[PDB]
Design an enzyme around this catalytic site. Structure first.
Site, short mmCIF file in Angstrom:
data_model
loop_
_atom_site.label_atom_id
_atom_site.label_comp_id
_atom_site.label_asym_id
_atom_site.label_seq_id
_atom_site.Cartn_x
_atom_site.Cartn_y
_atom_site.Cartn_z
N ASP A 35 -0.27 -7.49 1.84
CA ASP A 35 0.29 -6.15 1.87
C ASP A 35 1.80 -6.23 2.06
O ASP A 35 2.32 -6.02 3.16
CB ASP A 35 -0.35 -5.34 3.00
CG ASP A 35 -0.12 -3.86 2.88
OD1 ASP A 35 0.36 -3.39 1.83
OD2 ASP A 35 -0.45 -3.13 3.83
N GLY B 99 4.55 -0.02 6.33
CA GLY B 99 5.68 -0.58 5.60
C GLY B 99 6.85 -0.88 6.52
O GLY B 99 7.75 -1.62 6.14
N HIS C 277 0.81 -1.21 0.00
CA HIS C 277 0.00 0.00 0.00
C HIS C 277 0.85 1.28 0.00
O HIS C 277 0.33 2.37 -0.15
CB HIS C 277 -1.08 -0.03 1.11
CG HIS C 277 -0.64 0.48 2.45
ND1 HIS C 277 -0.25 -0.35 3.48
CD2 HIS C 277 -0.62 1.74 2.95
CE1 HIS C 277 -0.01 0.38 4.56
NE2 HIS C 277 -0.23 1.64 4.27
N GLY D 243 1.99 6.49 8.61
CA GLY D 243 3.36 6.95 8.45
C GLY D 243 4.35 5.89 8.89
O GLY D 243 5.54 5.96 8.56
#
Ligand SMILES: [Ca+2]
Length: 223
Positions: A84, A178, A40, A175
């Protein structure tokens, strides 16, 4: 990271910042030329920043390298965030040192109850938004699938794992996406999603990295 603490300078050497004019996601350095992040967080052009502590001040240990190949998992579902995960091949290998190092891929899926470290430059508030300059850290345990969904306003798939606290107050947030969830030196999760940030009964949801080790290696070998 909401309710965490400022990491000691360069103590999370595998942590990277994905930058597109500003920090928008985190990632983990798995070898001298590859970074693993969340699908994403995909963008057509990304500059990977390594050796960072304060993302807004040049400190002397940074290495900024452009992404050459950005590969999302073929089955990434943007609605549910299932699969993801994304791999980024850097335009050139980085110089590995004390402040820029790799994190190991998992050998097995960690059990519930394992203590892990989550890090990132994401939002530090459970309400509103505040982006920190310094890398934040949070020590949190892997939770059992059942306890996560008990009073949450969401459900997860077999490729997801909940990490955090059912009482709230401490969690990853926008933020941090990942970014890494490292337990006993192995990358076990990737910051993916959650309902709100640090809310009671709603722990964060992470991509279960142990389910993709084979995909990761094949992709790295084929590119
Ligand atoms: Ca810096």
């Amino acid at each position: 990271i909401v309710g965490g603490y400022t990491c000691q300078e360069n103590s999370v050497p595998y942590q990277v910042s994905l930058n597109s004019g500003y920090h928008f996601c985190g990632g983990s350095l798995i070898n001298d030329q590859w970074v693993v992040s969340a699908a994403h967080c995909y963008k057509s052009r990304i500059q990977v920043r390594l050796g960072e502590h304060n993302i807004n001040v040049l400190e002397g240990n940074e290495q900024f390298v452009n992404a050459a190949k950005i590969i999302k998992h073929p089955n990434f579902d943007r609605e549910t965030y299932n699969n993801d995960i994304m791999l980024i091949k850097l335009s050139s290998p980085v110089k590995l040192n004390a402040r820029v190092a790799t994190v190991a891929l998992p050998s097995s899926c960690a059990p519930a109850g394992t203590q892990c470290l989550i890090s990132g430059w994401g939002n530090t508030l459970s309400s509103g938004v505040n982006e920190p300059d310094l890398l934040q850290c949070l020590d949190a345990p892997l939770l059992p699938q059942a306890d996560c969904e008990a009073s949450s306003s969401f459900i997860i798939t077999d490729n997801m794992v909940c990490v955090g606290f059912l009482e709230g107050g401490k969690d990853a947030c926008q933020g941090d996406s990942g970014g890494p969830v490292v337990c006993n030196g192995e990358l076990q999760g990737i910051v993916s999603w959650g309902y709100g940030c640090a809310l009671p009964d709603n722990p964060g949801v992470y991509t279960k990295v142990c389910n993709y080790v084979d995909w990761i290696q094949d992709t790295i070998a084929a590119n």
